[PDB]
Curated annotation (Swiss-Prot), chain A:
Reported effect, residue 22 to Q: In MODY10; reduces binding affinity to INSR; reduces biological activity; reduces folding properties
Top-level taxon of origin: Eukaryota
Part of the full-length chain shown: 25 to 53 of 110
Protein name: Insulin B chain
Impact after mutating residue 10 to D: In HPRI; Providence
Organism listed in the record: Homo sapiens
Amino acid sequence: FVNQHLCGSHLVEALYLVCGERGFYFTKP
Amino acid sequence: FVNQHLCGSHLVEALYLVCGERGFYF
Amino acid sequence: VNQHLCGSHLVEALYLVCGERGFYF
Amino acid sequence: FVNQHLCGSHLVEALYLVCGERGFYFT
Amino acid sequence: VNQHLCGSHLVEALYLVCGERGFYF
Amino acid sequence: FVNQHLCGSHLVEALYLVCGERGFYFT
Amino acid sequence: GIVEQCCTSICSLYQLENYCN
Amino acid sequence: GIVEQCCTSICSLYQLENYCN
Amino acid sequence: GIVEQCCTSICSLYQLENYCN
Amino acid sequence: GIVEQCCTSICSLYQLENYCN
Amino acid sequence: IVEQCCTSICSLYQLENYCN
Amino acid sequence: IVEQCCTSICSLYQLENYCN
Ligand SMILES: [Cl-]
Ligand SMILES: [Cl-]
Ligand SMILES: [Zn+2]
Ligand SMILES: [Zn+2]
């Protein structure tokens, strides 16, 4: 799961630059 | 707001390494 | 110099927001 | 892919370095 | 080079999970 | 300093690069 | 759910937004 | 909420985990 | 130089967007 | 060397931990 | 250099050459 | 290196005198 993971890394770098202020809930299944 | 932002960045890098399946709020 | 390292995040956000676009440094 | 998205983010970073004043540029 | 890059996330998760120590290189 | 943390996240990432085999240590 | 939904393939900035509250 | 919580000063791994459901 | 502008205030998603090529 | 080991399974947090000086 | 250097590693007489 | 190199900048002839 090396790579779900190198990724979920850069995803979250990213929801962040983006939900700006309303933010979000992150279910990893 | 340059440097908050340089930083929210290095943050959510790090939430993720760490919550892994339960999800998160806030 | 900050400018030699912002130079480096800028070089990277520029690199996610700029998506594919790139940038001159 | 999420994988090379990730590698470029890396070289941008190397040239900034060798060249100096002299600079360098990245596409 | 995954290895020279995971070598650099790893020199960085190693530089984040490893902090000051440095690492053998 | 989130700022030199953030600069060394960056030099490590740099000598990894200059010395090559010979390595270099980053200490 | 979002991972099921963004790791293998890149999510841009909008999608990423439903999952916003 | 979390920003306020981690930007000028370095956040280590466990803080980060509360915000977890 | 940009070095001199975004490294000087933040740019919204909307302002970075400004040095991109 | 390291590059050899974590770069193959994830290392839970547990396994990265092995290369630090 | 993404590809010269994302597939094998590059020297500095070599990255010298990528300035100015 | 942080002197010759984080507040000004080092060149690599100079970063080379830092290798093994
Ligand atoms: Cl990577
Ligand atoms: Cl930085
Ligand atoms: Zn990476
Ligand atoms: Zn940085």
